[model samples]
Target: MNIFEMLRIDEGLRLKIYKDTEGYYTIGIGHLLTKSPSLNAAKSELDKAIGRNTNGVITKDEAEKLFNQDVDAAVRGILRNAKLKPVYDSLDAVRRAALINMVFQMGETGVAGFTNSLRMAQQKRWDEVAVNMAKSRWYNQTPNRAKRVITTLRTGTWDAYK
Candidate 1:
């Protein structure tokens, strides 16, 4: 199998830290650095990344960079979807930011699945967009964030986006 496929199947794209089967602290696509940096150093880095004094975490700045990288990748996928790009581009900065956040949370295909919402966005129907966003499984799964995004869509203001 190809290297990319192998990593995708075995390592997976883990943005967060997790314990491997051997209980070693690990992060970032199954990189197990149990020896070189020492677990203590890794914990320190993690502490910096997570903004809490936690072991086995990455720094906040690093975390943000990874988030941006992943989000940018997701945006590329969204644009590739074709149907979402025009509506996505037509949105205002705040709304566009909201869409980016949503796409990050749900993925390009997940956001594309929001056909009614996309339609409402293209039609400039803020009310329906808000409703559509709130009415989805994504909202039920993450209600508070969805509400905030829906509110931002409705008001055309930025709030709680970060």
Candidate 2:
């Protein structure tokens, strides 16, 4: 079997819309719907992928493309709009990647909602930012992921989690 077929078997194929493990709206193999501008670049892509009036059935290639596009938009949006841009700039690549991953999981606004965490990061208080993140509901919802991110934030080590 091809790699795509292997992935299809691993990720499983669903023809209809459903809630993912984290409760996000998803369809096709594992395309998580986003409010990001990935779909804004082409409304028809959204219509084809998961429009309300249409049945969501994307090809595997389309699903992968959407995921990549959304991730790129999330990273770009965060870099463009995050108020504490310098704080993000100060991070090592690993820490920066973790932060971008958080931005991907939660929209820019959602990450911005962590006012205290942002403030701590701005103040260069890495440990405090880690603690603040750990205390949040986001942490509760995704403990393992949060812990890895928190660890990276607490210690400027890139190899903490890959």
Query: How do all models score by TM-score?
Result: 0.62, 0.68
**All models, RMSD in angstroms:** 11.6, 7.0
Off by over 4 Å in 1: 1-56, 159-162
Instruction: Report the backbone clash tally of model 2.
Output: 0
* Model 1 lDDT per residue over 7-45, tens place: 233344555566654465566644443433366766765
Model 2 sits at a Cα RMSD from the real structure of 7.0
RMSD of 1: 11.6
Q: Residue 23 CA error for candidate 1 (Å)?
A: 18
- Angstrom error at residue 154, model 2: 2.4
Question: Taking the tens digit of each residue's C-alpha lDDT, what string does model 2 give over 1-162?
Answer: 222332243345665555666655666555566433343323444465543344345556666666566556766887788474665787776567666666766668878888888878777788778878888888898787677667766776644443
Model 2 clash pairs are none
